[PDB]
Amino acid sequence: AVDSKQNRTSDFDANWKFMLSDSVQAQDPAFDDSAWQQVDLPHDYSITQKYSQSNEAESAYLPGGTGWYRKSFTIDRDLAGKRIAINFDGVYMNATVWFNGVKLGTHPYGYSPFSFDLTGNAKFGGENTIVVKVENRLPSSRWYSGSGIYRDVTLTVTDGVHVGNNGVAIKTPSLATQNGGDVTMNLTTKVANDTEAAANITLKQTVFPKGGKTDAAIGTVTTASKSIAAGASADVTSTITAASPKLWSIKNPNLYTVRTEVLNGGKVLDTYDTEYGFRWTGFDATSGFSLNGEKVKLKGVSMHHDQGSLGAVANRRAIERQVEILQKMGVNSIRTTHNPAAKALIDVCNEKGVLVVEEVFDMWTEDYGKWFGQAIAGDNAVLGGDKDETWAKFDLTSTINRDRNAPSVIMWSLGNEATSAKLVAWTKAADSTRPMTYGDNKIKANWNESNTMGDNLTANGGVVGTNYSDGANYDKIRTTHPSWAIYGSETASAINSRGIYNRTTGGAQSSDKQLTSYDNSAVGWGAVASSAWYDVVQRDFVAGTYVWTGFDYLGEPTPWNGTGSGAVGSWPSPKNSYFGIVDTAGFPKDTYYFYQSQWNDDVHTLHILPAWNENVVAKGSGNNVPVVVYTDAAKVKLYFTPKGSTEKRLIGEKSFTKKTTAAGYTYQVYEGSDKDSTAHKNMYLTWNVPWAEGTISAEAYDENNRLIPEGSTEGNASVTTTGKAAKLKADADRKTITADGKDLSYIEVDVTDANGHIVPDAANRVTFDVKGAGKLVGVDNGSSPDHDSYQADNRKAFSGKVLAIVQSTKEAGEITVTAKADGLQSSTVKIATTAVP
């Protein structure tokens, strides 16, 4: 049902048919697909298949396969003469596209956007059929990719004379000094003349605050007449003087719409909008990163693309929720390891104020490595980037073309350890406004290839990323290469489960397929969170850090990882990662509050581990339990209240010492008499407390030695011995969502005792009854070795918590979700859905 009522670019996600099959040939329009599954995109056809130990642990034991997507739709007569194109923000992988039986082309890479023109084969005034074949033979990748059309699909309908796809490039080369007054904008606009007659057009271009009207423009320009031959294109340059634009920054992500109208005489033929933000960055070899002339430490996380129980589906609300949970931790930057992000993530970070280091590739047997250095066939009409060299150039320029105007994107990352020099040149030619980079692992060993490749980055205005360097290695790079601007492109790789306290050690396979929540567990080549941050926060020349990872992701379940088929350990084997600060369900681990005490200067943190039940704590020498406090306060007083008492007694008091760097960054370290012999562990506080039923509570004091109001800080300011499990506590993060068939509500359910305290080891199976104008689309507990179906109506809680994800329908109404558990009191939440205006 495509006609003239839809916008220039319109949502094309609804009403597809899907079939998983390696034998069908379903490209012909007359193919009978009446027995196929009916799905709304985005869609992941790996996440619904069963785990199998004949698959690979690194990709979560889930299969791939060959998936077919079909959509039959109408093109109304009122679109005769118009240009029509279908745009894929991502298809994993090896896509083949037919339109009305005619093959249009292929796209190997599973992570980059691409499009196809439909005009040449369209049946105007009749039925049309688009077919997409997806092939994921599952040697695959080092992490869970998912399979299928896992990102949004859109249709673009334009006049014959129109702005090209991603056709507007914006530069503000003097912003750093023009800031506050008139800012010069240099724009380049690609205008295509897909008619059979010569076109003579002008452009009217306007810059106005996002969501506003054109009468609020801070700058406009009309260009002189440009002649464009029939079937040709032209690059129209123009200059706008923007009157005192609001800068885009982390705290104030002010956004603008740059509207381009293609006029013929006094008639608008095409109107193209692009999102923009005014900001400039800088990387200094001595003092690190700056945003809008102000020094900023890159407090970053590496993030894979999948969304937990939803698989690879790039749902906008799922992505938005991730960024919001990271922001509460104090994260200000995301590295899209190791592939282009969904456009949805770029939109979210533009709106939320998060700096994005957008990575384009991982490395440089049937995977993308075969296609990286191959040319694009002459009869492959795929569109998106340059087609004159290799697929790598196409996918790189396609990503840059999509995101070149996004203010959140500060850097282009080219990979993660001849070809390097080619990628760097392609990036600089494609977008000169941002530095390029990559994460190099062999800089530690100081290979001659790393010295050369690092100098080549700097010579082209790039920034050097070093993977898993410690403080000594940071200093060696700084001394050996005084001209390099460096940062920790991949750090920490601590491995932890959520809610595990009966031991404080880890870093290797255990006996319960879980790992300690204490920050004493990391892979051999990595470091614990306190060690990786201590080395960065001391050094102004280390611009920042990108912790591996922010969220747990499917696949790579190190220390239970495995290349090749076969279970690692006893089945069911761990199938998602342990690197994340937050688990796949969005539930933070304990180290989340360490980072928050280090990074979030808008909140106060006071967090105690472990949970204070005898069957979950670790008893060391003298039956003492190691108690850890994460906090940003200057001083902490620790108390203990015996079970059945209302009076607390002081059991310790420790003050932080504040350190300041030359650039002005401040951090805290404990230098008391009983400090830890490992310096980085003194970024938090530790007490050895004898076990006894009761409550351990903490009070926070500021630099003036005065109390911080309790309850106003984040984290568990106290831990108490709980009773047995008695009731469930459900809570929806959003109690009203949009009835568009896309919006989600996340319902965390906690297992609590009769007094509401979370039972720290509770694993009761919780059943979800979803009624009304919504559907259950996922259940999750973040537990790596749990193989229960994400699409079931039930799941065991893990460490006292379980998650339910409900999706709206396209009819406004109410959703009722009841969480049930044998012997426990149920909990019910109600979510309203509101129609789209």
Ligand SMILES: *[C@@H]1C[C@@H](O)[C@@H](O)[C@@H](CO)O1
């Ligand atoms: C850095 C590269 C990333 O893909 C992960 O494999 C990580 C594991 O520690 O190291």
Ligand SMILES: [Ca+2]
């Ligand atoms: Ca703080």
